[PDB]
Design a binder for this molecule. Structure first.
Ligand SMILES: *C(=O)c1ccc(O)cc1
Length: 307
């Protein structure tokens, strides 16, 4: 499909809703995001431990949407008995419902395409955009993976009432709401993000990620490398969104933005290879991560200087 990518599952869902219904401000606020996190506790619990944002809900993006656009993303919780009639009302009023779903039931990505035939099924929260309720099925978009599908009513209800690795889903839905949308200018969105990235030392979390990778040389369980590969797609997507913003709005950027994107892509390639090819190159991967930390810090300072 030609869906809004955003930079993560949550932002893809909000942006796809905003794109379809030409809701102002949402897309530009998502596409200007500049963030990195690292959670060492999540690393050792096999949760999505790095990349743009903790999840599944990007609470930082919710704050940016409130503060810049006066846009609230309201969490709704429902029950098995009420959830579908709630959906019918939402589809009549708004045409789309953003729902939290256990990815275990979504087909979305084909790992056999990348020669990974033994991908373990995992109970992991994800987002879908519900477009249609039938008597025994629903139609959903996964905008993050540019995928749409018909799901059985049984599988849809199961997926929305699942205990996952990152919490209990109870028919959670997300409403984009405003009392009165506020306008922002593209340089204002970027200055705020790049200053916050430096003030909160987000480049430091890249270095922390690097330091933990160095310490996995004897870890027989390489799942962390696969999890890391998936988590860092959000960073590649932010780099691509900033290049796109630069072209669209004729912005002055530091000259090494595509180089940095290429650096993150190589880290992702090396983690995927480490996961599956049995190599002993934790030090090589750690070194690349610790280098990109330094380049990203200098990049953020250069954005503030030249923008
Ligand atoms: C997004 O929420 C998401 C969740 C899980 C996988 O595997 C991929 C994407």
């Amino acid at each position: 499909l030609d869906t809004f990518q955003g930079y993560n599952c949550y932002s893809s869902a909000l942006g796809e809703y905003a794109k379809q219904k030409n809701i102002d401000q949402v897309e530009n606020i998502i596409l200007s995001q500049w963030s990195f996190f690292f959670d060492e506790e999540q690393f050792y619990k096999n949760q999505w431990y790095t990349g743009a944002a903790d999840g599944p809900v990007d609470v930082v993006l919710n704050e940016d949407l409130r503060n810049f656009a006066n846009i609230e993303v309201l969490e709704h919780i429902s029950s098995e008995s009420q959830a579908i009639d709630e959906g019918r009302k939402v589809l009549e009023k708004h045409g789309l419902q953003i729902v939290l779903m256990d990815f275990y039931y979504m087909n979305s990505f084909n790992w056999k395409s990348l020669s990974r035939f033994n991908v373990t099924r995992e109970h992991d929260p994800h987002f879908a955009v519900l477009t249609q309720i039938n008597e025994n099925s629903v139609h959903i978009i996964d905008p993050y993976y540019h995928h749409e599908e018909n799901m059985s009513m049984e599988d849809f209800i199961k997926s929305r009432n699942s205990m996952t690795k990152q919490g209990k889903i109870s028919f959670n839905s997300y409403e984009i709401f405003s009392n009165g949308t506020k306008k922002s200018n593209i340089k204002e969105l970027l200055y705020y993000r790049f200053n916050r990235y430096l003030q909160e030392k987000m480049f430091g979390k890249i270095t922390q990620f690097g330091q933990v990778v160095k310490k996995q040389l004897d870890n027989k369980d390489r799942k962390w490398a696969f999890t890391g590969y998936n988590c860092l797609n959000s960073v590649v997507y932010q780099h691509q969104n900033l290049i796109n913003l630069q072209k669209k709005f004729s912005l002055e950027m530091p000259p090494n933005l595509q180089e940095l994107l290429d650096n993150w892509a190589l880290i992702r390639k090396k983690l995927f290879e480490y996961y599956s090819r049995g190599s002993y190159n934790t030090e090589e991967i750690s070194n690349l991560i610790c280098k990109v930390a330094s380049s990203e810090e200098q990049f953020a300072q250069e954005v503030l200087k030249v923008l």
